[PDB]
C-alpha cells in the first residue's frame, strides 16, 4: 500500500465531487443492467481470453498489487551482503549465515546451498538467472490480465452504450420525463470508461513497474551471490552497483 | 526555450480568438468546477502507476523543457575537443589538468579521468555506453509520465462530460436550458482534448526529442573519450565526429 | 475447455440479460442484414487476408480453443523424468528400450532416439530450439487469423451502420420511420463490436496464451532431455526444472 | 515529379469534388475556423520540437520536391566494376579515379583515402555510422511530419467541438448558426484534409526517400569496399544486383 489506495481514494473522490457539484444522485449509478454489462462483460471477455491456470491467479496478484513492498531495496542489500562474505574470506566459505534468518527469499538460500554443494566460477548463474527469467515471464503472464481487460472494458462501454442506444429508440416519444432511459446508457458508458481507464490500465502499469523493479532486485541478488562466491572485497561492491543506482543515489549512498 | 513558450502562447491565443470568434466568450470553461476530474484524475492515474522515485520529478522535469541546453552543443565541441587530446600528445597522459578545469560537467570526467588513470580502452567505452543507455531509459521513464498523462487526460475529460450529461438530462430536460447544460457539460471533453492533447503529448514529444539530442551529444562525447584515450591527429577527429552535426553546417565549418 | 465455453456463455448471457433488462428483447437483433453484413464480410475479409494454406486451419484452430491441453503438465514430468538418469547410470545411455515408453509427446520420442544413437549435446539443443521456434511461428500464424478477424469486424460494424444510415436518412422522415429504421439499422456496430472485441480478440489472445504455455512446456522438455542425456544427478533435476511451476506447487513438493 | 503530380491531383481532387457538388467555396474561404487547425498544428509542432522550425521545417519541405539526380544502382555496375579492374591492374594508387568523381561527399572519403589508409574494418564502420546519422537526421523531419499528421485531425476534432459548444448554446437566433456548425464542418474538413492528404503522406514520402537513400548509400558501401580488394570484378556483380528489383535484373544481361 501507500501508493495504490491514496490514488484510488483520490480518483473516487474526484468522481464524487463532480457528481455532487452539478449532478443529482450518485445512487442512480446503482443500476443492475449497466453494472452487469460492464463488469460481467469485462470479466467474461477476460475468462474467454485466458486459460484456467492463469485466471485462478487473479487474487494472488490482486493482493500483491496492494500488499506493501517492505522487502528489499537496492541500497539495503549492501548491509544484506558483504558481511558474511567477510566470514567467507577470513574463516571459510561454508559459514552458513543467511540460512538462519532467510527473511528475503528462498532464492539466496539456494545460493548458499549451492555455495556449500554445487559451487562454480560462473556456471551457478544459469539456474539462478533462468529462475529470474521464468519468474519474469510469470509476472508478464500476471500483468497481461489487466491490459486486455482495459482493452475490452471501454469497448464494453461502447457495447452497453449502443445497447442503450437501441433501448432509447424502442418504444420512445411519450412526451414526458422518461428520457432518463438514455441516462442508463450514460451510466453504462460512465461505468465502462471509469472502470476501464482509472484502475485497469493503472494497475496493469503498476504490475509492470513492480515487475521491472523486481527483476532489477533479482539481478542485484545475482550479482551479490556471485560476489559472495568469489570473496569480492566489500569496497569493490561499493563501486560495482554504481551502474544500478540512479543519478540521485550517487551521493546519498556514498558513506 | 524559444519554442515551448512561443507554442504555448500560440495554442492559447488560437483557442482564445477561435472561441470568441466562433461565438463563445471564454466564460463557459471558466465557471465549471468539474475540471477537477482532469486535474485530480491524471495525478491519481500517474501515482498508481509510477514509483515515488520517478514521481516528484513532474515540476523538476516540467521545467527542463524551458531550460535550453546551453551546455556543450556539438559545434562548440570540435574546437574544444582535439585540444585536450592535442596537448596530451606533447605533455603526456598524466596531465591531470585535463580534468580539474573540465570538472564543471561531470559526464566527461567519468571516462577521461578513468582513462588517464586506468588503461581500459574498451571498458571505458563499455561503461560509457552502459551509462548512456541507462540515461536513455531514465529519460524514457521520465517522458512516460507525460505520454501517459496525455493518454489519460481526454479520457478523464469525457469522464467529466458523461457526469455533466447525466446532470443535464436528469433534472428538467424539456427547455432551452438543455442546450446550455449539455454545452457547458460538453466543454469538459473540450477541456480534455485541449488541456490534454495539445500540451501533454507535445511536452512528451519534446522530452523525447531533447533526449535524442542529448544522447547524440553523449555519443559525440563517447567518440571524444575514445579519441582522447589514443591521441589521433586533430584533423582525423575533425572528420570523425563531424557527421553528427547537419551537413548544411558542415560546409560552414571552415572558419 | 474449463474456461472457454464458460466465458462464452457468460458473455452471451451478459449481453442478453443486460439488454432485456434495459430494452429490446432480440426483436431488432435478428433482422438478417446487419448480421449478414458483419459475418459474411468478416469471413470474406479473412479469406482475402489469408492464403488458402492458412484458411484451411480455421476449424482446426476454432476447436483447439475448446479441446483442453491435457498433455503432460509440468508437475508430472518429475516422476516421468528423474529416473532416466538412473537408467543412464545403471546400464548407461545404451537403453534401446528408452524410446518406446514415449506414448504421448510430440518430439520426445525422436529426440530421445537422436539422443541415444549418439552423443550430440549441442545438436539436440539447436534441433529442439528450431523445432519450438517453427512451432511458435506456426502458432503466431494461427493466432493472426483471429487477430485480424477482430480487426476487420468493427470496421464492418461501421460499414453496416453507414449503409443503414443511408437507408434511414433517405426514407420517410416524419416522426417514426426515421427512428424505427435508425434504431434497427444500428445493430451492425453492436454485433460488430461484440464479435470483434468480446469474441475474436480474446480468442486470438487465448491462442497466444496456449501457445506460450506449450512453448514453456517444450522448453522444460528441452532442459529435461538435456539433463537426462548425460546422466545428471536425479536429485537436482527437481532443482533444475521446478522453477517453471510456481511456489504454490513448489511447496506442494512435500509429500 | 512524383511528389508534384500527386499534390496537384489531390488539390484538384478536393477542388472538383467540391465544385461538382458544392456551390460557393466561400464556406472554408475565411471563417477563421481554420485558425484552430492551421495555427493549432503549427503550435503543437513548435511545442513538440527543439528549434528545428526555422532551421529544418522549410529546408526538408524543399527536399520533398528535389528529384534526386544521384547515381542510381543500375549505373553503379559500369562504375564500380571497371574501377575494380583498374585496382586489379595497378593497385590502390588510382588517384585518377576520384579526381573526376565530382559527386556527393559520401564517395571521396572512401575513394581518395584508398592510397593512404586501411579501409576494410574501418571505412565500412565509418560509412555505416554516417548513414545511421543520415537516417537520424531524416528521421527528425519524418518525425516532424508524422507528428503534424497526428496533431492535425485531433485539432480538427477540437475545432469541431468548439463549433459544437458554440452551436447548441449560442442558439435560438437561427441566422447565427453559420459560423458554429459550418465552422465545425470546415474544422473537421481541415483536420482530415490537412494532415491526412498532406502530413501523413509527406511523412511517408520523407521515409521512403530516406530508405531509397539508405539502400543507395549501402550499395555504395559495398561498392567502395569492393574497390579496396578488387575481388574479380564480375564476382562483384552478384553481391549487389539483389538490391535493384527483379524487373530490371533480367535486363542486366549485357
Amino acid at each position: 500500500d501507500k501508493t495504490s489506495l491514496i490514488g484510488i481514494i483520490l480518483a473516487f473522490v474526484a468522481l464524487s465531487v463532480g457528481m455532487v457539484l452539478k449532478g443529482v444522485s450518485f445512487s442512480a449509478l446503482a443500476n443492475p443492467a449497466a453494472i452487469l454489462i460492464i463488469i460481467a462483460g469485462t470479466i467474461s471477455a477476460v475468462v474467454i481470453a485466458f486459460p484456467t491456470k492463469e485466471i485462478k491467479k487473479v487474487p494472488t496478484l490482486f493482493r500483491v498489487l496492494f500488499k506493501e513492498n517492505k522487502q528489499l531495496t537496492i541500497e539495503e542489500l549492501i548491509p544484506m551482503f558483504s558481511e558474511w562474505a567477510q566470514l567467507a574470506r577470513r574463516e571459510g566459505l561454508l559459514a552458513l549465515e543467511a540460512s538462519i534468518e532467510d527473511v528475503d527469499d528462498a532464492f539466496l538460500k539456494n545460493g548458499l546451498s549451492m555455495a556449500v554443494d554445487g559451487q562454480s566460477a560462473e556456471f551457478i548463474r544459469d539456474i539462478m538467472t533462468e529462475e529470474v527469467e521464468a519468474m519474469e515471464d510469470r509476472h508478464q503472464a500476471g500483468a497481461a490480465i489487466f491490459t486486455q481487460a482495459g482493452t475490452y472494458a471501454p469497448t464494453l462501454g461502447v457495447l452497453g452504450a449502443v445497447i442503450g442506444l437501441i433501448a432509447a429508440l424502442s418504444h420512445m416519444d411519450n412526451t414526458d420525463e422518461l428520457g432518463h432511459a438514455i441516462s442508463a446508457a450514460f451510466v453504462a458508458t460512465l461505468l465502462g470508461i471509469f472502470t476501464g481507464y482509472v484502475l485497469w490500465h493503472p494497475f496493469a502499469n503498476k504490475l509492470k513497474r513492480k515487475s521491472k523493479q523486481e527483476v532489477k532486485l533479482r539481478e542485484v541478488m545475482i550479482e551479490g551471490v556471485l560476489s559472495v562466491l568469489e570473496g569480492q572485497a566489500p569496497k569493490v561492491i561499493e563501486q560495482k552497483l554504481l551502474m544500478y543506482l540512479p543519478a540521485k543515489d550517487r551521493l546519498k549512498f556514498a558513506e | 526555450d524559444k519554442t515551448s513558450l512561443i507554442g504555448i502562447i500560440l495554442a492559447f491565443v488560437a483557442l482564445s480568438v477561435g472561441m470568441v470568434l466562433k461565438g463563445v466568450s471564454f466564460s463557459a470553461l471558466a465557471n465549471p468546477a468539474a475540471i477537477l476530474i482532469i486535474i485530480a484524475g491524471t495525478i491519481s492515474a500517474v501515482v498508481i502507476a509510477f514509483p515515488t522515485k520517478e514521481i516528484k520529478k513532474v515540476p523538476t522535469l516540467f521545467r527542463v523543457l524551458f531550460k535550453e541546453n546551453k551546455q556543450l552543443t556539438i559545434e562548440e565541441l570540435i574546437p574544444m575537443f582535439s585540444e585536450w587530446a592535442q596537448l596530451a600528445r606533447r605533455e603526456g597522459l598524466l596531465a591531470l589538468e585535463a580534468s580539474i578545469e573540465d570538472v564543471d560537467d561531470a559526464f566527461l570526467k567519468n571516462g577521461l579521468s578513468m582513462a588517464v588513470d586506468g588503461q581500459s580502452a574498451e571498458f571505458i567505452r563499455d561503461i560509457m555506453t552502459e551509462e548512456v543507455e541507462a540515461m536513455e531509459d531514465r529519460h524514457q521513464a521520465g517522458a512516460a509520465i507525460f505520454t501517459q498523462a496525455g493518454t489519460y487526460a481526454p479520457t478523464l475529460g469525457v469522464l467529466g462530460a458523461v457526469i455533466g450529461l447525466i446532470a443535464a438530462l436528469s433534472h428538467m430536460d424539456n427547455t432551452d436550458e438543455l442546450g446550455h447544460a449539455i454545452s457547458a457539460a460538453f466543454v469538459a471533453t473540450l477541456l480534455g482534448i485541449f488541456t490534454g492533447y495539445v500540451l501533454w503529448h507535445p511536452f512528451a514529444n519534446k522530452l523525447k526529442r531533447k533526449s535524442k539530442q542529448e544522447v547524440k551529444l553523449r555519443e559525440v562525447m563517447i567518440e571524444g573519450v575514445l579519441s582522447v584515450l589514443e591521441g589521433q591527429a586533430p584533423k582525423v577527429i575533425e572528420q570523425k565526429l563531424l557527421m553528427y552535426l547537419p551537413a548544411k553546417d558542415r560546409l560552414k565549418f571552415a572558419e | 475447455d474449463k474456461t472457454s465455453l464458460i466465458g462464452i456463455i457468460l458473455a452471451f448471457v451478459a449481453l442478453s440479460v443486460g439488454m432485456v433488462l434495459k430494452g429490446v428483447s432480440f426483436s431488432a437483433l435478428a433482422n438478417p442484414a446487419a448480421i449478414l453484413i458483419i459475418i459474411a464480410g468478416t469471413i470474406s475479409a479473412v479469406v482475402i487476408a489469408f492464403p488458402t494454406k492458412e484458411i484451411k486451419k480455421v476449424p482446426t484452430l476454432f476447436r483447439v480453443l475448446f479441446k483442453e491441453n491435457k498433455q503432460l503438465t509440468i508437475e508430472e514430468l518429475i516422476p516421468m523424468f528423474s529416473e532416466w538418469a538412473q537408467l543412464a547410470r545403471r546400464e548407461g545411455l545404451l537403453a534401446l528400450e528408452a524410446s518406446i515408453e514415449d506414448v504421448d509427446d510430440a518430439f520426445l520420442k525422436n529426440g530421445l532416439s537422436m539422443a541415444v544413437d549418439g552423443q550430440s549435446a549441442e545438436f539436440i539443443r539447436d534441433i529442439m530450439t528450431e523445432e519450438v521456434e517453427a512451432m511458435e511461428d506456426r502458432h503466431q500464424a494461427g493466432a493472426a487469423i483471429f487477430t485480424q478477424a477482430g480487426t476487420y469486424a468493427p470496421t464492418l460494424g461501421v460499414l453496416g451502420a453507414v449503409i443503414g444510415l443511408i437507408a434511414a436518412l433517405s426514407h420517410m422522415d416524419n416522426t417514426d420511420e426515421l427512428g424505427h429504421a435508425i434504431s434497427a439499422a444500428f445493430v451492425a456496430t453492436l454485433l460488430g463490436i461484440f464479435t470483434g472485441y468480446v469474441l475474436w480478440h480474446p480468442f486470438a489472445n487465448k491462442l497466444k496464451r496456449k501457445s506460450k504455455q506449450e512453448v514453456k512446456l517444450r522448453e522444460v522438455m528441452i532442459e529435461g532431455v538435456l539433463s537426462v542425456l548425460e546422466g545428471q544427478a536425479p536429485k537436482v533435476i527437481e532443482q533444475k526444472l521446478l522453477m517453471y511451476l510456481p511456489a504454490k506447487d513448489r511447496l506442494k513438493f512435500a509429500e | 515529379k512524383t511528389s508534384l503530380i500527386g499534390i496537384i491531383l489531390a488539390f484538384v481532387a478536393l477542388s472538383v469534388g467540391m465544385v461538382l457538388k458544392g456551390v460557393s467555396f466561400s464556406a472554408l474561404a475565411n471563417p477563421a475556423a481554420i485558425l484552430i487547425i492551421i495555427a493549432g498544428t503549427i503550435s503543437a509542432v513548435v511545442i513538440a520540437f527543439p528549434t528545428k522550425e526555422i532551421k529544418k521545417v522549410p529546408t526538408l519541405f524543399r527536399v520533398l520536391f528535389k528529384e534526386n539526380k544521384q547515381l542510381t544502382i543500375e549505373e553503379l555496375i559500369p562504375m564500380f566494376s571497371e574501377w575494380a579492374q583498374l585496382a586489379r591492374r595497378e593497385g590502390l594508387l588510382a588517384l585518377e579515379a576520384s579526381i573526376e568523381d565530382v559527386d556527393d561527399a559520401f564517395l571521396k572519403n572512401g575513394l581518395s583515402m584508398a592510397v593512404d589508409g586501411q579501409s576494410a574494418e574501418f571505412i565500412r564502420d565509418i560509412m555505416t555510422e554516417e548513414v545511421e546519422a543520415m537516417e537520424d537526421r531524416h528521421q527528425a523531419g519524418a518525425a516532424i511530419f508524422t507528428q503534424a499528421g497526428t496533431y492535425a485531425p485531433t485539432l480538427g476534432v477540437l475545432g469541431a467541438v468548439i463549433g459544437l459548444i458554440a452551436a447548441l448554446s449560442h442558439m435560438d437566433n437561427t441566422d447565427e448558426l453559420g459560423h458554429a456548425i459550418s465552422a465545425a464542418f470546415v474544422a473537421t474538413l481541415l483536420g482530415i484534409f490537412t494532415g491526412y492528404v498532406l502530413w501523413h503522406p509527406f511523412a511517408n514520402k520523407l521515409k521512403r526517400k530516406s530508405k531509397q537513400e539508405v539502400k543507395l548509400r549501402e550499395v555504395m558501401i559495398e561498392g567502395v569496399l569492393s574497390v579496396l580488394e578488387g575481388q574479380a570484378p564480375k564476382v562483384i556483380e552478384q553481391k549487389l544486383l539483389m538490391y535493384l528489383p527483379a524487373k530490371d535484373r533480367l535486363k542486366f544481361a549485357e
Binding site: 462501454g157 461502447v158 432509447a168 420512445m172 | 479520457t155 469525457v158 462530460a161 450529461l165 471533453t189 | - | -
Partner: peptide, 26 residues
C-alpha cells in the same frame, strides 16, 4: 500514436446523436 481514447468520445457522440434523434420528433 497510441490513440486509445476515441472509444469514449465516439460513445458520447452516439449517445447525444440518438438523443437529438429522439428529440427530432416534429
Amino acid at each position: 500514436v497510441d490513440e486509445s481514447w476515441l472509444v469514449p468520445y465516439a460513445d458520447i457522440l452516439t449517445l447525444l446523436l440518438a438523443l437529438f434523434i429522439v428529440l427530432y420528433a416534429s
